[PDB]
Design a protein around this nucleic acid. Structure first.
Lengths: 116, 49, 134, 207
RNA sequence: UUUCAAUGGCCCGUCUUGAAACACGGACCAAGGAGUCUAGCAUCUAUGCGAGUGUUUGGGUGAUGAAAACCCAUCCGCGAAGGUGGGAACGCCCUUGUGGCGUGCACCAUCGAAGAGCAUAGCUGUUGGGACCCGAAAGAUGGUG
RNA sequence: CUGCCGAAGUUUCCGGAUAGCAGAAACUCAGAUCAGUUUUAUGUGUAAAAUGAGAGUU
RNA sequence: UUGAGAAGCUCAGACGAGUAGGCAGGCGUGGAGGUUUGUGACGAAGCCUUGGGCGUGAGCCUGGGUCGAACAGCCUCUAGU
């Protein structure tokens, strides 16, 4: 049982081509969703900062975005992560606020029945 | 009579934890010297440039 | 035994070509010694640190005057020492960190060709070597 | 100015020289740095001078560039050349060292000629000592080891030889040979000290 | 070149045996035909950098094959954690030469208590892997009459 | 295919680790040590003249 | 005096068995990047031949006869050599 990496330049170009069709389908929105900033859970890397999965419910409510719409404007949700330190709430709320600063939202046509 | 066998298990963790921070510090300390230890401009090399 | 370098650095076959003439046309032992060490393998030419050179010239009674240290091999620096002294050094290679440190505060660095045109007979030169054990 | 001196065609390198005619006659003080930048341009003007007849006419043109400079900065113009030839002397290659030998031969003769001219205005001992101070902080300085000996042996070889040409009738008493006597005394290049008198042609008949 | 004249010379390979003796293998010709490919380790040398070192997991990119080349983000691996004399080389000499006066590398004696790697390529070595090539009844699973 | 070097063929303990021979490198010396050497002489061994060769290490 | 492929040229002396084994320089085959502004229907490659040469040798160059569409020297790369 042996594996060869001859398709390594083939697979990389397939991935790039897979990104370009995604960009074609969804033009204005970025090819990647926003991710939060979290700290690795170990004494070795705890002083580091990296990306998370999504923004917890305290990070959404504090920033001012409901949890239902957040999934629609590209902000992802992590029901499992929680905020134990306020610096973790702060680094990710401002991460949301800077995102909503640059976020153009296209209006959608809405059904308007004659009566009500 | 010493700690525990799994308490010496953490002895690597108090040995390996200060690896990443040491390595990151070595990266910036090397770069800091690089800014310091650079050759001056040689003002005679703009005669033609 | 050794009378042709195993190297293929074309410029080392020009440096040897200069010190083959000097060794056989002068009566100095500095040239006969320099030529021999241009034949030595990379293993036999240890790096010699700047601090080790700084200690050797400024050793015991100091009185460095303006002697030129000569070593066949690299001269890597020593960030563990802050104040480098004035030094005139000749070597095959420097390290960009070291060569800047010599140049920035003090004298100058030289290649083996610039030493030869100044002291073809080894006139007032210290010939050092790095620690071989490694 | 500077770029055109090192041009790749003589029809434009030549025109830079007489455009340098007015520039070097300016009646204002020139810093050393401006002369060093200029001299690189002039050093590369001579670098590609092809024909032997031409490359020995240009040396005489460049030697003649000395007396036309203002009297104040004539020393600085001479000093930079000896500095700008000492550092790039190692760069030259055997076929291109037969013209900088002569070029240095011309300039070292032009230094004596300026002394003869300035002897008519001021005291000979005063100007010669000032020129002697030019050798003290330049080519004949013991503090810097960066200076090649090939120029220093050359200067000793042609020192007195061009002294006779500048003074056909006789040379007056002066410290003409002081730079060597201040080098074979305390220079730290023991090979240069040891073999300088053997190539000098020093005579003390007038000194 | 064929042939003759004079002088000569026990069939080759293996194996055996001090050696042979041997016993083998050889009817002849052509073609095919056996230290290879790879991972690990150590050594020597070459190269790049050097208290550092290593782009190729991946991303960026590459209009003339675009599986190449070129570029670098976050990690990560491997490193990093004083006197005495003998001494290489040099200077001062000075009866020069001879030697002395010194300065003393690598290192060794002595008393003692101013990092040299990392990566690539090669060579030889070693351990695995089908392991230089050929050759020992197999055994097991599953089928056939 | 040619060229150079070229053993051991066995001590010794014990399938081996040694050694030895051959190399390969690094060293320090010829004003230094040597020798399947020979003398001299002291009591066959030992120690100190000739004859030669540069010799010793890791 | 021209004798700097300094990896060259030149001078002197001694030496030369060889298995196991160690070291070095070369010859040859297929293909690969560079090159010879290379060769080829006025004859490539191949083949035979008591043609002529070259090299200690592995090998090479050439004449003749057949032959009919490809091939090679050099520097490196490479291996089902």
């Amino acid at each position: 049982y042996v594996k060869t990496w001859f398709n390594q330049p083939g697979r990389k170009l397939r991935r790039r081509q897979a990104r370009q069709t995604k960009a074609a389908k969804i033009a204005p929105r970025p090819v990647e969703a926003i991710r939060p900033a979290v700290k690795p859970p170990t004494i070795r890397y705890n002083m580091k900062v990296r990306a998370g999965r999504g923004f917890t419910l305290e990070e959404l409510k504090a920033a001012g975005v409901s949890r239902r719409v957040a999934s629609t404007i590209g902000i992802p949700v992590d029901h499992r992560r929680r905020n134990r330190s306020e610096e973790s709430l702060q680094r990710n709320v401002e991460r949301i606020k800077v995102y909503l600063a640059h976020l153009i939202v296209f209006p959608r046509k809405a059904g308007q029945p004659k009566k009500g | 009579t010493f700690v525990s066998s799994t308490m010496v298990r953490a002895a690597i963790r108090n040995q390996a934890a200060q690896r990443y921070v040491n390595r990151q510090e070595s990266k910036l300390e090397r770069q800091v010297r690089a800014q310091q230890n650079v050759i001056p401009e040689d003002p005679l090399d703009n005669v033609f440039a | 035994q050794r009378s042709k370098p195993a190297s293929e650095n074309v410029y080392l076959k020009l440096l040897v070509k200069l010190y083959r003439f000097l060794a056989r046309r002068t009566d100095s032992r500095f040239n006969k010694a320099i030529l021999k060490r241009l034949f030595q393998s990379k293993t036999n030419r240890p790096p010699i640190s700047i601090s080790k050179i700084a200690a050797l010239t400024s050793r015991k009674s100091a009185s460095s005057q303006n002697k030129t240290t000569v070593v066949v091999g690299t001269v890597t620096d020593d960030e563990r020492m802050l104040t480098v002294p004035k030094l005139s050094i000749a070597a095959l290679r420097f390290t960009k960190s070291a060569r800047a440190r010599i140049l920035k505060a003090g004298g100058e660095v030289l290649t083996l060709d610039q030493l030869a045109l100044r002291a073809p007979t080894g006139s007032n030169t210290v010939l050092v070597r790095g620690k071989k054990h490694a | 100015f500077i770029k055109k001196l090192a041009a790749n065609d003589r029809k434009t390198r030549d025109k830079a020289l007489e455009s340098l005619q007015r520039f070097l006659s300016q009646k204002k003080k020139f810093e050393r740095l401006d002369f060093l930048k200029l001299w690189k341009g002039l050093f590369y003007c001579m670098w590609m001078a092809d024909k032997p007849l031409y490359q020995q006419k240009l040396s005489d043109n460049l030697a003649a560039l000395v007396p036309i400079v203002w009297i104040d900065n004539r020393i600085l113009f001479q000093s930079t050349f000896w500095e700008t030839m000492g550092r790039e002397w190692t760069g030259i290659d055997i076929l291109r060292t037969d013209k900088f030998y002569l070029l240095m031969r011309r300039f070292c003769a032009a230094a004596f000629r300026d002394i003869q001219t300035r002897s008519k205005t001021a005291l000979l001992d005063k100007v010669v000592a000032e020129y002697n101070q030019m050798w003290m902080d330049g080519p004949f300085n013991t503090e810097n080891l960066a200076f090649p000996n090939g120029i220093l042996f050359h200067l000793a070889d042609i020192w007195t030889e061009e002294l006779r040409k500048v003074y056909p009738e006789d040379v007056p008493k002066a410290d003409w040979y002081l730079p060597f006597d201040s080098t074979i005394k305390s220079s730290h290049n023991v090979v240069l000290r040891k073999t300088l008198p053997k190539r000098l042609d020093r005579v003390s008949e007038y000194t």
